[PDB]
């Protein structure tokens, strides 16, 4: 933290933030949402990390060196530390770059490597090679050294993200899927693992040994895994809560802004609100069927009738405010709903359906106020604009995601939020071969679209293939999109530190302070 000359700092310095649920895990290498990635960030730093502002940092990497943007060179800072006072080496990267690959540990992010291109990584993944055979290597103790098998301009961007944090070997060989617990667990990020209580808190204290210790002003913090976004709310106006979770409910938005206005955090937010269909599923494998879904849904309504938070209506997967992001905006997204309905509606006539024998499926979300709300609102539009019937389902958290991976559903409230800013963050995941691609579409014309975009050494022709790979997406009809989130969220005056002006929102509570008050 970089405490402003002047601000005096409250004696106690504890922070309680919301999380939205209880986080998956917190092993690096299984986990892949946001809930989950607000805890890993305090507790496990990789080679760069995002500064306040968002950008790419030094995190154990002090400096790096790129040759032709594929051999990619990164000095390890000499104290750099884990929690029991080892080291922190290239080696543990090679460990844990190759753990984040091999197919035994079935990560939901062993595409990442795909996706930044280190060399041999399809053959690992498929099983053709062993995960040592890597392009990863430790020339020394304080040197890591990455190769791609093709330029990436952006790589250090990826290197931010959970999945490419360093894991410890010997607590991961000796407990297993134990090695998270408190009193198994060894961390390097600004923060120790205290307490884990499923469905309650998660409690993490100051970590000595982080090498930048001396900044850290937080003493201690609490994640909370409150799914509803109105008792969030009510709990942090209670005085419980300091930051709630970047949720707002329906119910008291509008209020909150005239009442609290200066506690009220909206920023621009890099992340989609779609429904996911499950295109592998009869009916949702005719995209006549998904056409007339995606055209039907009335954003207009959704977005400034009935959530009205300063979102804006969607008509693309890749944020059009994405780095690099030169959108095409559809014809049908400028025609009037009326003419969005007929299409929609004559499309599933010609799929087959009638009054007599109609449309019905699920509507799977994850247990939250403001999802339900949405949820109800689509399926009363749906069946208003469409004569298609839907029975919503709610799951918690870690099952909903479990159950998208599993293909176990119709359609899903969904929400991608950059990994790095750039289009491939989204559009990687729609890949045939992703390992996040839980829409389960497959499109060879899609996947030659993104190969093509490291194949040319120029940004305007790549602009131009990822704006050609959301039109295929979109002819496709891959997915439901709705509105572009705000990060929109409550924040206590004395919480000091949160600038908002990260699209990424990648918060580590070593930057932040409590003012006195």
């Not at 009193?183 to 693992?193: C, D, E, F």
């Not at 509008?254 to 009220?264: A, G, M, R, S």
């Not at 006539?349 to 009638?354: H, K, Q, S, V, W």
Request: charged share 25%.
């Amino acid at each position: 933290a970089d405490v402003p000359a002047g601000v005096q700092l409250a004696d106690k310095q504890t922070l309680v933030r919301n999380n939205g649920s209880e986080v998956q895990s917190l092993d690096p290498h299984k986990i892949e949402g946001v809930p989950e990635s607000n805890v890993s960030r305090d507790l496990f730093e990789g080679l760069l990390i995002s500064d306040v502002e968002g950008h790419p940092s030094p995190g154990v990497a002090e400096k790096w060196e790129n040759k032709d943007f594929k051999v990619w060179t990164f000095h390890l800072r000499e104290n750099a530390k884990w929690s029991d006072g080892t080291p922190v080496t290239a080696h543990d990267f090679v460990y844990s770059w190759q753990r984040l690959a091999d197919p035994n540990t079935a990560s939901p992010y062993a595409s990442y490597l795909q996706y930044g291109h280190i060399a041999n990584i399809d053959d690992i993944i498929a099983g053709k090679k062993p995960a040592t055979d890597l392009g990863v290597k430790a020339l020394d103790d304080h040197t890591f050294e990455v190769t791609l098998s093709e330029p990436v301009p952006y790589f250090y961007k990826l290197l931010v993200h959970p999945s490419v944090s360093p894991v410890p070997k010997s607590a991961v060989e000796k407990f297993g899927d134990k090695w998270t617990q408190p009193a198994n667990i060894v961390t390097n990020g600004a923060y120790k693992l205290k307490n884990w209580v499923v469905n309650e808190r998660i409690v993490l204290e100051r970590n000595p040994q982080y090498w930048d210790n001396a900044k850290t002003v937080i003493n201690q913090v609490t994640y909370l895994p409150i799914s509803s976004e109105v008792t969030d709310v009510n709990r942090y106006r209670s005085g419980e809560i300091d930051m709630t979770y970047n949720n707002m409910p329906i119910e008291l938005f509008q209020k909150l802004k005239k009442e609290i206005p200066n506690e009220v955090r909206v920023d621009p937010y890099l992340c989609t609100y779609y429904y996911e269909i499950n295109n592998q599923k009869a009916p949702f494998n005719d995209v006549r069927v998904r056409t007339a879904l995606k055209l039907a849904l009335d954003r207009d309504i959704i977005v400034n009738k009935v959530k009205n938070q300063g979102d804006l209506p969607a008509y693309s997967y890749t944020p059009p405010y994405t780095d690099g992001a030169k959108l095409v905006e559809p014809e049908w997204f400028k025609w009037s709903q009326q003419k969005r309905n007929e299409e929609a509606k004559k499309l599933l006539a010609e799929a087959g359906f009638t009054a007599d024998k109609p449309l019905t499926f699920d509507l799977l979300y994850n247990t939250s106020d403001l999802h339900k709300k949405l949820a109800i609102a689509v399926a009363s539009i749906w069946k208003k604009n469409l004569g298609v019937n839907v029975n919503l389902e709610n799951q918690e958290w870690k099952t909903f995601l479990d159950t998208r991976h599993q293909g176990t559903f119709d359609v899903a409230r969904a929400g991608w939020c950059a990994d790095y800013n750039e289009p491939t963050s989204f559009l990687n995941t729609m890949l045939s071969d992703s390992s996040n691609n839980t829409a389960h579409y497959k499109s060879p014309a899609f996947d030659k679209l993104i190969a093509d975009t490291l194949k040319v050494a120029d940004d305007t022709q790549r602009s131009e293939l990822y704006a050609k790979a959301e039109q295929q997406l979109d002819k496709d009809s891959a997915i439901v999109p709705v509105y572009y989130y705000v990060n929109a969220r409550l924040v206590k005056p004395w919480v000091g530190g949160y600038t908002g002006k990260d699209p990424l929102d990648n918060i580590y509570v070593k930057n932040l302070y409590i003012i006195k008050h």
